[PDB]
Amino acid sequence: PKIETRTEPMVINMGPHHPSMHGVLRLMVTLDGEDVIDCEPVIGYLHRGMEKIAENRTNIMFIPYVSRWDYAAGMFNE
Amino acid sequence: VFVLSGYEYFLGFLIICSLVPVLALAASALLRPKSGRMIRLTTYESGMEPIGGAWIQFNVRYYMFALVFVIFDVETVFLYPWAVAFHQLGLLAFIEALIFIAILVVALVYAWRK
Amino acid sequence: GTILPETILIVTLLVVLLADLIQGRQADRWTPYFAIVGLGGAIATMIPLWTQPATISFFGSFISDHLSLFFRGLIALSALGTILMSIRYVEQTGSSLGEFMTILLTATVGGMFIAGAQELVFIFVALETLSIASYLLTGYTKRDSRSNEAALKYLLIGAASSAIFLYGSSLLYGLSGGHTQLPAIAQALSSESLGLVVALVFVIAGISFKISAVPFHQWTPDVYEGAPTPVVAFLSVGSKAAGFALAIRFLTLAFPSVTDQWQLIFTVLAILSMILGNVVALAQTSMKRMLAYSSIGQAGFVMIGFVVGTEAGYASMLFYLLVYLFMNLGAFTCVILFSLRTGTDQISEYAGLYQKDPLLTLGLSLCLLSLGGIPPLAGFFGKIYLFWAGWQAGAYGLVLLGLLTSVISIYYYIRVVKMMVVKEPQEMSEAVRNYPELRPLQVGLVMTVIATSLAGILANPLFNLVNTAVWDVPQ
Amino acid sequence: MQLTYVLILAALLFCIGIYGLVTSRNAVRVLMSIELLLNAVNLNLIGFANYLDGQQIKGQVFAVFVITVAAAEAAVGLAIILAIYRNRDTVDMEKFNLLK
Amino acid sequence: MDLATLTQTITFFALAAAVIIAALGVVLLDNVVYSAFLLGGVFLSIAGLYILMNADFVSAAQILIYVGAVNVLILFAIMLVNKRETYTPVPGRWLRQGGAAVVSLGVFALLTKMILQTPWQLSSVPPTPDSITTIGQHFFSDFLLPFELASVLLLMALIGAVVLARRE
Amino acid sequence: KFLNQITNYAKEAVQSAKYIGQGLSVTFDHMRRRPITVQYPYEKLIPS
Amino acid sequence: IDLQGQFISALQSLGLSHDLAKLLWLPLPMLMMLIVATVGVLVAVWLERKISAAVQQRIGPEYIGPLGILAPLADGLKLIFKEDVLPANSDRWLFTLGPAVVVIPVFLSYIIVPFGQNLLISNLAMGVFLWIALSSIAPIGLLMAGYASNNKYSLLGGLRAAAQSISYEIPLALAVLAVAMMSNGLGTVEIVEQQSQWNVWRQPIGFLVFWIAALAECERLPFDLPEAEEELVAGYQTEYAGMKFALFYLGAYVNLVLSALLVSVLYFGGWSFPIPLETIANLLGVSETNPFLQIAFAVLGITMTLIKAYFFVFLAILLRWTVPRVRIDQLLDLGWKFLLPVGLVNLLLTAGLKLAFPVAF
Ligand SMILES: CCCCCCCCCCCCCCCCCC(=O)OC[C@H](CO[C@@H]1O[C@H](CO[C@H]2O[C@H](CO)[C@H](O)[C@H](O)[C@H]2O)[C@H](O)[C@H](O)[C@H]1O)OC(=O)CCCCCCCCCCCCCCCCC
Ligand SMILES: CCCCCCCCCCCCCCCCCC(=O)OC[C@H](CO[C@@H]1O[C@H](CO[C@H]2O[C@H](CO)[C@H](O)[C@H](O)[C@H]2O)[C@H](O)[C@H](O)[C@H]1O)OC(=O)CCCCCCCCCCCCCCCCC
Ligand SMILES: CCCCCCCCCCCCCCCC(=O)OC[C@H](CO[C@@H]1O[C@H](CS(=O)(=O)O)[C@@H](O)[C@H](O)[C@H]1O)OC(=O)CCCCCCCCCCCCCCC
Ligand SMILES: CCCCCCCCCCCCCCCCCC(=O)O[C@@H](COC(=O)CCCCCCCCCCCCCCC)COP(=O)(O)OC[C@H](O)CO
């Protein structure tokens, strides 16, 4: 029922469920006593395949699609 | 013999207050869905699976902050009857309590300097 | 009320703070001095109140008679001798020196307070002040596993001994109505009962832990190997001083001398100490462990001073307890000086030291022979007075055992002088074959060695002192 | 509720603390047993103060001091245990024997 | 023969049973954290026993220090030293276990005989209710040396413990 | 050397107190304005 | 009036063993204080949700009751009916006990909340000191909620919670110390009856220290570290589902009404409509046995206590949305580096002013 502390660098998973507005990013980060040794960001939880779609849609068919890459401002990418 | 006046209420109220959680948590147990056993029973790791190993990388970060707390927790116990009885004492007790507090201040400075 | 008897302790107390704040600001400091100066001032503060005033009490909670001054000066001198040895020792280790001298001076303050304390609460507080600082000093070199295991062992034994002593103190407070005072308990209970015997044995269990009386001895051989060697030097002189002071002030003055079953108990413990601590010391390979068992044996010797208490056994005990300071400070200074240079090792590595370093040999052999009881030397007269104070009372068996154990001790004390002198250039140990070729260490070594060789024949000036101190023990 | 009952209870707590201090193998449990022992002592002191010396209570101040110093000795003992653990990497009290 | 004394007896025996069971759990249980919490249970029961003995200040002080400071320290340290407990059984165990058991039972019987035999001086005068002002008077009149030396005790304990548990 | 550190500490503490008092006043002022909430089920927002 | 006198007398009129009547009365105040504590919890939840909405140009709950009055009732009844979960390898008995050890001593500290004289459960001799001692059991509850979890996420939250609740216990005691210096004692009624014509005007530093320490009891968004959602998900609470989580949700607002009432009684006083009311001899009222004047002054005292408790509840749930959070290390520097020195300084200052000017102290 416990976690068995041991003198190593600890790896914590700030996984895909970010209770914030910073999308879905995994960020497996290790730390040695309130530091950061190195983090491995695990992106890709929102790869829907826009590049392969764009090859099969005409321009006016694709222009509604573009407002998604970088949501916000959905007019730069337009 | 017992001459502590006010006690009668601390025992009865201790009972009636300890009865609040063990009654609400039993009323909730009577009327609530049954089991949810299979995979409801895992540990929340932001949706992913626990990485394995699962240690903490022990730190003295929270032993020293409890050592220094024990020290001054004892200090307050030593200082309470001095403050409550500061009327009958007068001077020459302020001097001794002041020596006590100065020693504890040097202790705090030592803990704060490292 | 009458805080004058405290201007000896508060001085040292001030040093504890001043040799601490300077370590907060500087961290590379010369606190070894103004700590020697602090103890020197604390000792010089005793001359005004050694003979000038009569015996005084703080509030009944502390007494400053001549016996108290004797033991306070004894513990202060032990701390002064330990500060000298521990300068280049804990500095050679990657550790601080101010945070060590504060602990050492606090242990000294506790030992000095427990000497003149005559109340249950204050006795407990002084004893625990000594014990906590003893644990902290034992586990100081936190890099070595032996030091940590020794500190853990010593703490687990000493805390249990203190719990037993506290149970005895609570029983003693409950038997005699209230009266946390010591002299007000003798007036209350003046008859042997089961409660009084149980309180007596439970106090003895916590006294013998301090003075190393067997079967309450089994920690010194494991603590002397573990602790830093200057901590061991302070622990074999100052801790026994405090323990014997507390035993005299407690047993004689609190436990109504009508219940002198403690004389039987201490006869048992002294016989057992003499027999064990000298027989087992005979088969040892390290110098610190040998000195541990030797220290047990010497405590057994001292315990025939106040087991026949006759105003001459007390004086014999005090004189041997004073000479033991010069013997053991000088026997530990040479051990430190050898383990510093190259050795860092045991008895077998002493072989051939007469060629490379003759001063260390001439200083260590003198102290080992003094411990053995060799004529003119501080130890011979100490032991002769211990043995005659034992015959003059009627304890034939105790003295006839002390003599045989003195021979057993001469054997393994001269076995070290064997290695130090005998060897030719082909029989030097590997630690002497490459022996190299720190001023306070030498100036403490020379002083303790010239004291252990002259305080034997120039003993008359420090027999009147012992007698005026003994005049205060009740009987 | 008599003095003899409180004293027998304190003696029995002393007994249990001794058993735990000698038998237990983990290293923090011996410290907890020492705390049990000191509580068995404080109970004696408070019982004596309540029954024998009830006006100028002197066992209660002595008990305050005992509690203070039990806290201090615990603060030092856990430090000693952390130091020995940092090097031996265990708390098995049957592995701190550097002797024969 | 009263309703007050009946409550003071029932509560005393309830707290005594709690003390015995929790103190046996501290030393017998195989898991160490259960012992760490039953220790706070012991301390709370003894704090109640103090209140039942007209000592209201020292009970609150015990709750502050033992089940509020020493217990939290013990819980932290028990967490710091978790390594899944691979204790291999040692042969010379039944010897020391049996010795501890017999010496404990013998010492307890001896103490019980001593307690039931000696004639304590009960001094039937009701105690004082204002038990904290008296403790305040004794810190600076009678117990001035211990009150003053406890400060240096705490300082040396802090110094030494920071030195031992430091990280370098 | 040591007085400049203390005067900087004071100039930081009093600044942190004023910059909390200002925010407290701003928030206590905010609760006088009419809520901009468009209480949907009974105050539906007419589209463009 | 002395309702206790009438109750015990009318109960002894029909026999029933007069000494037993005094035992048959304890449940009456022992549950009146429970009632007022539960109503205070409902009020605190409602005030938080409706004041955070006003601060942000918003509207709180309005479709539950008339004004969202039934919002705390719904939020509690939901958590009652929720399925409780106990994860795979978590302990089974320290799990369901953490949320109860963090709650029982928060309720028990209501013995000393006066609400006017003779209107409190058994004014105790230890009073505020008993509360200082009882407020040290919750860290055991947080360590228990963290140790009994297979989630290393939540053990790290239990540790940083138990390490914050002990950081703000020394200054919280050094402020009550300076108050008890002036108060001549520790009982709350005896602490407040020194206001006979307020301690905030003579302890202007101890008030600040006490209030900051009480707000830093893992309570408010100034700190609320184990509840700081963004940095870590709920800390130790991240695994409690039904009533076990409602015990945390509840033991954190009762621990706020309690602190508001305590600041009121220590530094302001649950009595004393500001003028020295009991010097209303100008209406020639024989207070002593006036059958009413008694009830009128009772109502005045209750209202004057609740005004100054609501003042601080309001100010706390206003600072929640005004002060930015501190990481954990800027937090542990408030205690032990700013609040502990200033607490000691305030204690020494009160001592010096009490020794020099024994009048007004
Ligand atoms: C969720 C939160 C809210 C929920 C409500 C709580 C649930 C209870 C609902 C029932 C409400 C009906 C009760 C009517 C209130 C009048 C009763 C009263 O005042 O009774 C008062 C008496 C007084 O007691 C006596 O009071 C005497 C004198 O008053 C003293 O009171 C203080 C002590 O000194 C003052 O300092 C004062 O100067 C002093 O003289 C003596 O002290 C006696 O020793 C003492 O026994 O106590 C008593 O029985 C009172 C005991 C019952 C407590 C209930 C009080 C509820 C608060 C209602 C306040 C109404 C405000 C105005 C209402 C109209 C709107 C404008
Ligand atoms: C056979 C089966 C039996 C099973 C038993 C179970 C069944 C239960 C029975 C019925 C349930 C009734 C429950 C409540 C009834 C009310 C009882 C009461 O009135 O009890 C009266 C009690 C008792 O105290 C009173 O106390 C005084 C008497 O002195 C004595 O009273 C106390 C007890 O001794 C103290 O010790 C005091 O020092 C002592 O001297 C008074 O004059 C009365 O006599 C006395 O009764 O009142 C107090 O305790 C003060 C606490 C109340 C104060 C109210 C302040 C109210 C708060 C405001 C409300 C709004 C809050 C909402 C906002 C909140 C936001 C923070
Ligand atoms: C004047 C009052 C008189 C009575 C008052 C009682 C109030 C509380 C109890 C309500 C009556 C039913 C209780 C039975 C317990 C239980 O849950 O059984 C299990 C069944 C579940 O159904 C069952 O579900 C079961 C599976 S499961 O476990 O629920 O998933 C399944 O086995 C079963 O066949 C299926 O039917 O559930 C019920 O019977 C009721 C549970 C929920 C009822 C909530 C009522 C809310 C009342 C609170 C608000 C009132 C305000 C204050 C009033 C004082
Ligand atoms: C922090 C966690 C807890 C730590 C400590 C827990 C330990 C509990 C504390 C122990 C409390 C001590 C013992 C209580 C003493 C009971 C007897 C007593 O107190 O005497 C009083 C009277 O005692 C009683 O009458 C109380 C007995 C009843 C208490 C029983 C508990 C009540 C249970 C709930 C009520 C149920 C009622 C319905 C039952 C049918 C004295 O009266 P007084 O204060 O007025 O002083 C003067 C006196 O009136 C005359 O001179």
Author numbering:
A (entry chain H): 2 to 79
B (entry chain C): 13 to 126
C (entry chain B): 13 to 449, 457 to 494
D (entry chain E): 1 to 100
E (entry chain G): 1 to 168
F (entry chain I): 2 to 49
G (entry chain A): 5 to 201, 207 to 370
From the paper:
Cyanobacteria express instead the inducible NDH-1MS (NDH-13) and constitutive NDH-1MS’ (NDH-14) photosynthetic complex I isoforms that convert CO2 into HCO3− by kinetically shifting the reaction equilibrium towards bicarbonate, against high cytoplasmic HCO3− concentrations. The 0.5 MDa complex has an overall U-shape with 19 isolated subunits. The core structure is highly conserved across the complex I superfamily, but in contrast to the respiratory enzyme, the photosynthetic complex lacks the N-module that accepts electrons from nicotinamide adenine dinucleotide (NADH).
